[PDB]
Amino acid sequence: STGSATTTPIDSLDDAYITPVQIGTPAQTLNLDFDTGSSDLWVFSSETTASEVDGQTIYTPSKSTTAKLLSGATWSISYGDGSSSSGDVYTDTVSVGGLTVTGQAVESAKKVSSSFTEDSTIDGLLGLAFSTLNTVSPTQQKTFFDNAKASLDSPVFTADLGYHAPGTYNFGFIDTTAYTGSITYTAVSTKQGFWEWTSTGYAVGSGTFKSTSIDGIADTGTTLLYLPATVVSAYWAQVSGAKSSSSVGGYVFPCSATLPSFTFGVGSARIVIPGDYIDFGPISTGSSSCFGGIQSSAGIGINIFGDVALKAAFVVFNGATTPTLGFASK
Numbered sequence: 438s439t440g441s442a443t444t445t446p447i448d449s450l451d452d453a454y455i456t457p458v459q460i461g462t463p464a465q466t467l468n469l470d471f472d473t474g475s476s477d478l479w480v481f482s483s484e485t486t487a488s489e490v491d492g493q494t495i496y497t498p499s500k501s502t503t504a505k506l507l508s509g510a511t512w513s514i515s516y517g518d519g520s521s522s523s524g525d526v527y528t529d530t531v532s533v534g535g536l537t538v539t540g541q542a543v544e545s546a547k548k549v550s551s552s553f554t555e556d557s558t559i560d561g562l563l564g565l566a567f568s569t570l571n572t573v574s575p576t577q578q579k580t581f582f583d584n585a586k587a588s589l590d591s592p593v594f595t596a597d598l599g600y601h602a603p604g605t606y607n608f609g610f611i612d613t614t615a616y617t618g619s620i621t622y623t624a625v626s627t628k629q630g631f632w633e634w635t636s637t638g639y640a641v642g643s644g645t646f647k648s649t650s651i652d653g654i655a656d657t658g659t660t661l662l663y664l665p666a667t668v669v670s671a672y673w674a675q676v677s678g679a680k681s682s683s684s685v686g687g688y689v690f691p692c693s694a695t696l697p698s699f700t701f702g703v704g705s706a707r708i709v710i711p712g713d714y715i716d717f718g719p720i721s722t723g724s725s726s727c728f729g730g731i732q733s734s735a736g737i738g739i740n741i742f743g744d745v746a747l748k749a750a751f752v753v754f755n756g757a758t759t760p761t762l763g764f765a766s767k
């Protein structure tokens with residue numbers, strides 16, 4: 438089997454991407470944020486505190502004939518941005534782009550933090566990191582991918598995120614028309630539960646490539662690219678007037694600037710992030726200070742190849758017995 442679903446930016450900045458997901462019978466379609474940096478499939482629901490729901494589409498398990506309470510199971514998750522959610526768990530049929538999993542753990546939110554409530558466009562998350570990070574207790578649950586794996590033509594999924602445009606998630610096959618050149622594969626460590634890999638270095642604009650190992654995670658659920666303070670300083674030093682602002686919470690730059698590209702290494706290969714991909718617009722409406730798409734990971738504990746990096750590539754998440762990650766230009 439295979440599946441293929443279009444993923445769509447939630448706003449003009451590509452802050453995140455939503456992908457329609459069918460849950461239950463008859464199908465209830467929710468727009469979920471596919472996140473290769475977490476491992477819970479959770480949704481706004483009929484059980485979510487009413488004051489915490491504002492415009493989201495909810496899953497109502499009582500209206501699904503295939504829904505079954507996973508008795509005693511609860512979940513609770515916090516994300517790096519400080520947001521959180523928690524609740525109880527049903528199993529139900531979940532389909533993505535024509536690919537169906539029966540008995541998928543669907544984590545129903547009883548509570549969500551304010552950031553989720555405030556974002557009407559995201560109805561939940563669909564985790565695609567390793568199931569060892571799944572928060573369901575007392576019986577940890579498998580991701581959608583993990584459940585689908587054995588049925589797939591090939592035990593892979595691909596992320597092809599668009600710049601200011603829709604893209605695609607495929608399950609079970611590699612679309613050889615979706616990228617240019619070849620796919621370079623690189624080792625993954627699953628020890629932290631992430632698609633963790635080591636970039637071979639970087640360049641800023643037309644500058645010389647610096648060979649240096651940068652360990653980090655491929656994380657579709659993170660908007661920006663978070664890298665060591667040395668690397669980020671070298672990048673923003675090439676933009677006149679750019680500076681790190683503690684009041685704003687990162688590097689900002691004059692909206693009148695032309696940003697240089699940023700290149701990262703995947704083995705001997707190179708992925709080039711165009712300058713424009715690094716512009717996240719005015720810090721507040723009408724401001725001439727713009728927020729940078731490359732930020733320091735210093736206060737995080739891990740480097741994060743988020744959407745800014747990933748959207749520049751066609752990315753293969755290879756879930757074979759020894760997982761690996763593939764990157765191609767496109």
Ligand SMILES: O=C(NC1CCCCC1)N[C@H]1[C@H](O)[C@@H](N2CCCCC2)[C@@H]2OC[C@H]1O2
Binds near residue numbers: 470472559737741
């Ligand atoms: O918290 C992170 N990542 C951390 C960011 C800081 C540095 C460490 C990693 N990812 C989350 C993301 O911000 C959320 N958000 C939704 C609305 C706008 C788009 C993003 C979304 O919900 C959970 C997940 O995706």
